[PDB]
Amino acid sequence: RSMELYLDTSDVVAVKALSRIFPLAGVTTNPSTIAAGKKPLDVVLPQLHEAMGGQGRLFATVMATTAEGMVNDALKLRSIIADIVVKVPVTAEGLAAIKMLKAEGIPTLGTAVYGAAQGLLSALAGAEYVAPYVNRIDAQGGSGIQTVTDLHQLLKMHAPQAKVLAASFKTPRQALDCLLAGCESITLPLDVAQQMQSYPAVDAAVAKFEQDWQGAFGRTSI
Amino acid sequence: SMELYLDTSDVVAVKALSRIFPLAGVTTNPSTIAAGKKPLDVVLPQLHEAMGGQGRLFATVMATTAEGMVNDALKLRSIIADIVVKVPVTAEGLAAIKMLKAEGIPTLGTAVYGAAQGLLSALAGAEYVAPYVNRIDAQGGSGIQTVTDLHQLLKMHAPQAKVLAASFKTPRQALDCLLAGCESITLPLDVAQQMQSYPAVDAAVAKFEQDWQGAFGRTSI
Amino acid sequence: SMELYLDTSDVVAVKALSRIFPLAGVTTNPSTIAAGKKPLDVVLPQLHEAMGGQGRLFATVMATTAEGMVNDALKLRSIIADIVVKVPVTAEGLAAIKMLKAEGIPTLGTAVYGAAQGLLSALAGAEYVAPYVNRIDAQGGSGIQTVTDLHQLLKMHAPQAKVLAASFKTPRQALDCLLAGCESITLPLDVAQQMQSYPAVDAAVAKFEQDWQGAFGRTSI
Amino acid sequence: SMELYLDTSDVVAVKALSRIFPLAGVTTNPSTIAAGKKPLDVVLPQLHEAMGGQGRLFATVMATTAEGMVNDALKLRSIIADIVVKVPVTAEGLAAIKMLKAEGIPTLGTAVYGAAQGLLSALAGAEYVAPYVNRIDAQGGSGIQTVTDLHQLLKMHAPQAKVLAASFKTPRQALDCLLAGCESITLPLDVAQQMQSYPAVDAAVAKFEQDWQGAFGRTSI
Amino acid sequence: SMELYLDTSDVVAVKALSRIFPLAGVTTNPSTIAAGKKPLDVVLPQLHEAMGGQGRLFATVMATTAEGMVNDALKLRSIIADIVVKVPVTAEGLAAIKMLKAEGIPTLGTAVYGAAQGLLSALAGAEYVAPYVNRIDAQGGSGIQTVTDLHQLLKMHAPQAKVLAASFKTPRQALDCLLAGCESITLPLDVAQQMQSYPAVDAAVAKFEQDWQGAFGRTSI
Amino acid sequence: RSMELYLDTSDVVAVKALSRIFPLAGVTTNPSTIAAGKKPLDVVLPQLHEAMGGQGRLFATVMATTAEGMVNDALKLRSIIADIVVKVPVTAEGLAAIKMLKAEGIPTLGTAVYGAAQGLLSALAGAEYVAPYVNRIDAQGGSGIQTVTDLHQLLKMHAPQAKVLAASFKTPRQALDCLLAGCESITLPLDVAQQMQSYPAVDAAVAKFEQDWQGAFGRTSI
Amino acid sequence: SMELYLDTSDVVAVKALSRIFPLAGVTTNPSTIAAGKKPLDVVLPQLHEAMGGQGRLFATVMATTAEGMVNDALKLRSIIADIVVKVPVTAEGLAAIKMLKAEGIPTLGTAVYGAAQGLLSALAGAEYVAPYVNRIDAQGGSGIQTVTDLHQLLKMHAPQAKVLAASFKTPRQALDCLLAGCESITLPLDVAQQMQSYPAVDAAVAKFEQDWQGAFGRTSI
Amino acid sequence: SMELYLDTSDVVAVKALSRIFPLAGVTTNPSTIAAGKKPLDVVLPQLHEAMGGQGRLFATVMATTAEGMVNDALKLRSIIADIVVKVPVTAEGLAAIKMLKAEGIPTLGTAVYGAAQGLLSALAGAEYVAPYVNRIDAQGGSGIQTVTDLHQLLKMHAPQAKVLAASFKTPRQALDCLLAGCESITLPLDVAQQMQSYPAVDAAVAKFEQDWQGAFGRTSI
Numbered sequence A, F: 001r002s003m004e005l006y007l008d009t010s011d012v013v014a015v016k017a018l019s020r021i022f023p024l025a026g027v028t029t030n031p032s033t034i035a036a037g038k039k040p041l042d043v044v045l046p047q048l049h050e051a052m053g054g055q056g057r058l059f060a061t062v063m064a065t066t067a068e069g070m071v072n073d074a075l076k077l078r079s080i081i082a083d084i085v086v087k088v089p090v091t092a093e094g095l096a097a098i099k100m101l102k103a104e105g106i107p108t109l110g111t112a113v114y115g116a117a118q119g120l121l122s123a124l125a126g127a128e129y130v131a132p133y134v135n136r137i138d139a140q141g142g143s144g145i146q147t148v149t150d151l152h153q154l155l156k157m158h159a160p161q162a163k164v165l166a167a168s169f170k171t172p173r174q175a176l177d178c179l180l181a182g183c184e185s186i187t188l189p190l191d192v193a194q195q196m197q198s199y200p201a202v203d204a205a206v207a208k209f210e211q212d213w214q215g216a217f218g219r220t221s222i
Numbered sequence B, C, D, E, G, H: 001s002m003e004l005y006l007d008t009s010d011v012v013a014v015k016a017l018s019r020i021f022p023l024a025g026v027t028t029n030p031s032t033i034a035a036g037k038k039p040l041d042v043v044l045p046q047l048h049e050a051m052g053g054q055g056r057l058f059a060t061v062m063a064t065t066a067e068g069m070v071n072d073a074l075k076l077r078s079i080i081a082d083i084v085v086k087v088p089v090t091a092e093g094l095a096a097i098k099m100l101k102a103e104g105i106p107t108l109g110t111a112v113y114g115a116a117q118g119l120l121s122a123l124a125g126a127e128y129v130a131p132y133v134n135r136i137d138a139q140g141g142s143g144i145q146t147v148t149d150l151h152q153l154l155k156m157h158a159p160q161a162k163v164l165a166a167s168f169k170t171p172r173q174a175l176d177c178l179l180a181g182c183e184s185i186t187l188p189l190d191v192a193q194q195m196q197s198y199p200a201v202d203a204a205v206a207k208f209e210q211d212w213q214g215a216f217g218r219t220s221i
């Protein structure tokens, strides 16, 4: 029943480096980070999978406007990565697509979720993950944390096969607050993930350990 | 696990929104049947087909004695074999719900304006109870508090029944009902159709498209 | 799952309301049987018949010593094989409830005015505990608070017992007991006949009939 | 499910109240043993007999060292084979409790003035933990708060142990302890009597009788 | 259920307190080893023996790089076969914890100053997470809040991990961690030595003795 | 706006002894304790007044059963003690009496109060103090603390010229809980007051002060 | 605005810390006076001048009878004319506080272990009430809860008095008292020192200096 | 009534954002002054001019000793006669704040990482206390909690002082500080720039424009 922690990036190098340190469940991509990488899906998706040692889940986003075109995008994505999770923006056509994909047996995530009812609808349609945009919700004068709180309650009561996968972070604290509200998965962008490697108090505590050790013995080693 | 219903008799709307929303069914009442100009024997099968043969239908008895309500219920079931029969929760309605429980015909208790009235309908055997959220507000109560209390009462005192909240003017009313734990909900057309547009979602998707076009010169996968 | 009871000895009213309400049985007390002016050997089979041979019956012992109360319990059980014996929660009553649990005759602890007294009766073996909600109010206490505390005590510390709340002047009191978790209830006649009319529900049904008429020329299905 | 105890060494009171209260046993302590002037080998079997040969008994060790306390335990168990041994929660007492757990002799941690101390006694092996509610109050703290915390600590961190609350001046202290989840309790005689007999219950039974003799000219059933 | 630990490497003190406290084991850290002036291969078997061969031991790695930390873990395990390896939760420590999870060596994430950092160590595979309660308090934050948050985060998002709170100045800090749900705890010597004597307890036992000798001439049973 | 602590007794020697220790505002008598004292009102009441050194408020209960009889009793009590406060049990006739005595300008207390509504009624009729029987309410299965809480709120919102004067106590904790609920005055029975009279922990702290002082100066005193 | 005190009789420390800390004065007690090994007539003026003639002084009576406590108050006030006299809140101390109020000498009620005790000392006339926060904890209670209740009691029932919390092992205890509304406080030396230096502050000041140096080739102006 | 500040040394940005926002002034620190590459004597009057010659300026001392910081403050006040001097809340900074209050120079206590530290700075005389919200988050605490506690501490215990919260990554952090009561705030450039873009507002206005055009054939008044 462990939580799932994802990297929100398309940057293969960073995924390889951070995979060594973090207990990562996989990588979420979106069209903007794919485009930023400049490499097409059929190139970058296997590269990201390789960068995680072949383990973990990948997510990528459909691009078509109509529900049926979104199903065709899903089929292409799955032909690139057989067990990829298909992200579908939760519009009306997106809801139709999510229902179609549930009928086809292809796992989906409802993305670009700005409110709890919209998120719950995508889960009822069949999405196994629902991704509210926490920081984006804030920026249009709402509360991303409250949306995550409500959405998580609604999924657990009314669509219990789905999880919240919160996205859109500017600080580690936002992600902490989402987890404290029960949200069962999370995808962190690169800078937020990197702010979680510091803690100078830990460094000083290890330094005092070493000073005491090299002071009773003649060693910093064991 | 929750059941989302559409509160209409408009067969065109049912077919359109069946494509978008995860509908569990359609609830009719006398007023939307009438406004549809079509008799039960025509529009009930049209509704059933408009959601692709899956889905639950609900329709309201019209008689005013309990035995008359049982008669109405039998006619409705002969029109649609698995239909759920809405009985307004009056004294006679409670009698009808009791008799129909005996008959093995599933019932919903409708026109509920208060938590205890709703619980009674559930105790008599209704497997759904439908408080009128917005109408409760309109006589100076709180439809949300009635749904909250009714849900608690059903979950500990009549656990076979669900709240099926109805009567909404805004999507937020329905969201508040769901947050209070209400297990099913039926939405009128304009509320469901407000749950379709999201400007910020379209702006994010348009930005995705623009970035994709800047990098790959295309708009497609 | 909840048990709804009628608190009366009036046989004609039990007959009348057993068709409408979903009754689990009837509770009598000394004052109620004395208003009836028919002895326990008459009115108890009549009350049993007026519920269609269904539903449970409750009646109160009159003796003052535990051994006397046990004798009364055997009398009542000889009149109605499956009757539940009401015992006022005094010291002797507590002793009698213990004795009756040893005998295997189900009891209810009645005339409870405080949570601790009620819990003691449940621990003695009573299956139901009956606080007098309104009478507690009149002592300057809070019937609702006592019911709330008693239900928590039973669920934590005597889980084989249920609160069967009694003594009501308004439907709201009974609803408040049910929302506090109280698992059964017995209503006096007037409070039963205040939950059986709602002008808003009749107006709703009337508007439904008006639309049906204005669209099909009939008020029938 | 809850265990109610009497906090006394008075064999007459035990006989008389075991007929009325659903007692699970009797708790003795050195002061009440002394006040009875009878040694343990006399008064413990008297107490066991006054409970009708059922019931759990508790007695306190008197030794000051762990190993002496273990010897006191063995003495106590020779007097009453299934007695629970009360050990004051001092450092030596914690030692004794661990030893007695190894020996298979059920203990109770007594003279508990704080929640951490009580949890320690339960972790060492005590199956009951006995905070002194009123004494804690008298020292400037809150006995109810200590019972509340200790019960939470036991259910999370030593789930084989129960709180057995002791030291009471009013029935309300006992009730507050039970509402806080306390699974067992032991009452001193005066509090136990205040829990029997309430004038409003007697007035209610008297009015029941009086109008049972108004219609019907009788006293009985 | 709960696991109580001593935070020390003083072998004599461990042998002494293991007779009184219900210890689950001993945690060491590099400062406390150094202050003991004995190397690991000497003092770890000594602490194990001083606990009587039962009990879990914990010891900290010294390397700065993840691979060297894995090395230290193997060495520690050669000294004590079932020892838990404490890894400070840095980036390299997180790497070391993931590697050690792959190796099947149980780990504790130590030097934890915030809830998210601790949660990460559990996700990487640590079975225990040790926030420094008082050191968080000293830097202006709240060690109790960090423990409260961390416990919730582990119970819902990393359920195979427990909080093992460390760094205490008062018994009240440890109590508050346990009231927050903390499933294990490691106490420094002075703090363990302060929940070891209670004046009001000794006064109660002396009152017992006084009454007992006023009645039976003697003390002892 | 200091609270008022009263002693609930008519034992003159206990009043003199306990007034030395405690900051008493006065003494409340009732018929039972006056009877226990075996001395008529015209002799105990002046004795109690002097046992408080002349300062201090006195309270005594009427014995008559009709409103006009109670006004008579009140006039007699005021002839004994010019500024005595007249206690009136809150019955229907008691309420009529309190209205009449308000008209007379004679301060009154509504006593034998078992419910918040009853107590508020007595204050509305003109009582300046209202005395719920905390422990008697606890005794018959209710909550004297809740009754004090509700009564205090009612008086502050709806009868602000009146104060709660809580009575009937088996423990000091009941009294502290009344005070924490805002109750503005309290009358303590002898045993409860006497339990508020020693604390071993304080004596241990003082003994340790003395022992450190002796170790440093060999003196024990200043 | 708040009064922050130092809880010491170390003259050198008082002079040092008075330069850093915004102190309103110094509280002495018999233990710290004795540890300084100088009598009152010597050390009190030394402390006064170590605060630069500003600041209030507090000192404790030694006598055990009320008359003796008053006599001690007179000696104390002849040494320091505006000193506040600390009286331990015993029965005799309550008497002494009453007498000193009648004399017009300001008092603090010390060694308060419970909220009602503290309230009594304020009612008797004490301008300050000093609970022993950490010592209340060590007895198994909660010093923080005592301070909270006492502050509420003083504000509604003895408004001329302030809580002056004392007895601290951590700065967090002090902070929790101030958050509870505590209007004055007195810190021992080690807690006082912990409250000034924070490594993260120094790190931020160093980063500021480094940026300045990089942009201007200096660390000044 | 609340005071909104811009946290920058960028003279151009100050002029731009002065046009939009209701600024009360500008806070500088060493890092932003340094990043601007202009000495205090040059950039501080530039900033004053960019604010239209009104509003408050803040600048930080660089010295490490109280006496050094005081002379730094004198230099600052010679550049800007009414400037507020930011002093990092260390021990030396505390002494500096006390001395500067003696000198009548307004100060702000900066680099506050905990509520107690900040309160000390206000008690020493600082008119403003600046916790570093985001930096507190970063080291494992909660900057929002620190702001909340500090604001309560200042309002109860140092009412002449205001929280001036700083260090922000999002507008939400600042909103949460204001909702906790914090009375002043200083925003970095990018957060201030997120607070001037509102897509839904632009959409509503464009809809206004379109309706006005469809009715009057023009877009203006």
Ligand SMILES: CC(=O)[C@@H](O)[C@H](O)c1cccs1
Binding pocket: B007, B029, B132, B134, B135, B166, B167, B168, B188
């Ligand atoms: C039973 C219902 O569905 C009603 O809510 C109907 O939709 C309304 C018309 C005007 C207010 S409510």
Ligand SMILES: CC(=O)[C@@H](O)[C@H](O)c1cccs1
Binding pocket: C007, C029, C132, C134, C135, C166, C167, C168, C188
């Ligand atoms: C237990 C009952 O059946 C109620 O009728 C109750 O006994 C009354 C309250 C007020 C008058 S009678």
Ligand SMILES: CC(=O)[C@@H](O)[C@H](O)c1cccs1
Binding pocket: D007, D029, D132, D134, D135, D166, D167, D168, D188
């Ligand atoms: C632990 C007990 O058994 C109680 O009886 C308690 O110790 C008291 C006796 C008298 C005043 S408090």
Ligand SMILES: CC(=O)[C@@H](O)[C@H](O)c1cccs1
Binding pocket: E007, E029, E031, E132, E134, E135, E166, E167, E168, E169, E188
């Ligand atoms: C080394 C640690 O992690 C702590 O266990 C240690 O006990 C403390 C040092 C300063 C305050 S507490």
Ligand SMILES: CC(=O)[C@@H](O)[C@H](O)c1cccs1
Binding pocket: F008, F030, F133, F135, F136, F167, F168, F169, F170, F189
């Ligand atoms: C009327 C009073 O003033 C009370 O003292 C009353 O007499 C009590 C009975 C039991 C405890 S208190």
Ligand SMILES: CC(=O)[C@@H](O)[C@H](O)c1cccs1
Binding pocket: G007, G029, G132, G134, G135, G166, G167, G168, G188
């Ligand atoms: C009056 C005092 O300051 C003492 O209570 C001192 O502060 C101590 C606290 C804990 C052990 S000694």
Ligand SMILES: CC(=O)[C@@H](O)[C@H](O)c1cccs1
Binding pocket: H007, H029, H132, H134, H135, H166, H167, H168, H169, H188
């Ligand atoms: C002290 C300040 O004025 C802030 O700029 C603070 O230093 C930071 C927040 C995020 C990165 S640095």
Ligand SMILES: [Cl-]
Binding pocket: C081, C082, C083, C106
């Ligand atoms: Cl049966």
Ligand SMILES: [Cl-]
Binding pocket: E007, E008, E009, E010, E032, E189
């Ligand atoms: Cl050690």
Ligand SMILES: [Cl-]
Binding pocket: F008, F009, F010, F011, F033, F190
């Ligand atoms: Cl008396």
